[PDB]
């Protein structure tokens, strides 16, 4: 029910939704070359996979809220045609979704949530029909799990020129693999306006601004999924484990080179400070010898030679004070040259350690690369296919049920069915190719049944039950 | 070949509301790679919860319009030789 400063396509509007919802005011105009170029680069024919480029970084702690206990949202809009694989206009008015070549999603990489554009794999977006409001030019759109949108688009109006606190464009613009949890906290959609409204379709992506704690949960999840993947892909694992060694080695080389510079400069300063001390000491040694030369007047306050002696003392103090400053500078240089020598040596060490490390990696990469790898079709034969609900015979009418029993291997849950008016549960045992029956209320095992006939292959096992999963 | 078996139930009643089979992908299981699901012990072996981030990646293969706000979705990766 509010209003917002006009924003341009690609711009990440930051706001803390009210009871009325989110306000979306778009400053129409061909998308910036900066964004358009990034998108162009992202589409570059890369290997199959979902790739992304982080456009903005979100900084929760910098959010200028009314009350820290709030839910801020970042809303990025783009012209629908720039996203959809096919012009939105050439789409049946009864379609609820549409394929897209790029989406703007929230992704977490290094303990930070960012707004990125991703592409490289087939994707679909919901098509939401915007509705009119009493206020002309103002439409409402309801996207799945997001506050109601009060969208407004103007052919030509000002545009916010600077990012709000909490969002920065200072990000690693390199193309990288989208995360496992990409878009985990984003809800997007192509918004199409009323028949004779005159507005072109607009893509809109709404992301929740995650808190430091929530960013951590995402990152831990990313980590766990990456590890599960590495655990099941020896080669791919060895690849990144080696690439990582390749980098750590290079970083160790730049390390030694940096320490060689520190040492070279330390030597230069050392010699220089040493010469200055050496010269300062000459002056001091001559002023001391001069007091000695006139010491014979040290007790004759009346003689003019006493003035020479007295003056000599003054010259000696001035020379000592200078020597003291010179000695301190030289000592600092000596400590620097010593630390630089140890650091350079230490860098030399780590660099060697890194060299061995990269060898173990470059070798293992080949060892695992020389092994036999089973193809997809092989995996498709490791377990027995599950029967189609309507093909399970001899058990009366069956209706699928929410999977819950954890699988022994892999990450799935056993396929579950319901029979006898929801009193009997049947789960598919893919390792033996048979159904296992269980009593609904008790969870107690009833036996093994053949899907083709419905006959009992084995009787009830008292030791088996799935009460823990209903 | 490979088929995505999608099933969904009502969030509150937990009652079955529907099932749909995607087209046959033959021996192309790249779909599971986009979901980050290893092939090992997962083909013809389990149903997976359709988490939110996965909807945009799965919706292209199904006529049913996935609605995770009203239902709970599950998908299994079934493989049988040839057409079926």
From Swiss-Prot, chain A:
Residues 215-239, 349-391 have a biased composition (Basic and acidic residues). It is found in: Secreted. Its EC number is 4.6.1.-. Residues 374-470 are annotated as: Ribosome inactivating activity. One of its GO terms (cellular component) is extrachromosomal circular DNA. Belongs to the cloacin colicin family. This is Colicin E3. It comes from Escherichia coli.
Curated annotation (Swiss-Prot), chain B:
One of its GO terms (molecular function) is toxic substance binding. The keyword Nuclease does not apply. Induction: Probably induced by SOS-stress. It comes from the Bacteria. The keyword Transport does not apply. Keywords: Bacteriocin immunity, Plasmid. GO terms for biological process: bacteriocin immunity. In complex with the cytotoxic fragment of colicin E3, Im3 residues 39-45 move outward to form a wide hydrophobic groove at the top, which interacts with an alpha-helix of colicin E3. The cognate immunity protein for colicin E3 (ColE3), protects cells which harbor the plasmid ColE3 against the toxic action of ColE3. This protein inhibits the 16S RNA hydrolyzing activity of ColE3 by binding with very high affinity to the C-terminal catalytic domain of ColE3. Belongs to the cloacin immunity protein family. Native colicin E3 is a 1:1 complex of A chain and protein B (Im3). Binds between the translocation and cytotoxic RNase domains of intact ColE3, blocking access to the 16S rRNA substrate. Forms a very tight 1:1 complex with the cytotoxic fragment (residues 456-551) of ColE3 (ceaC). This is Colicin E3 immunity protein.
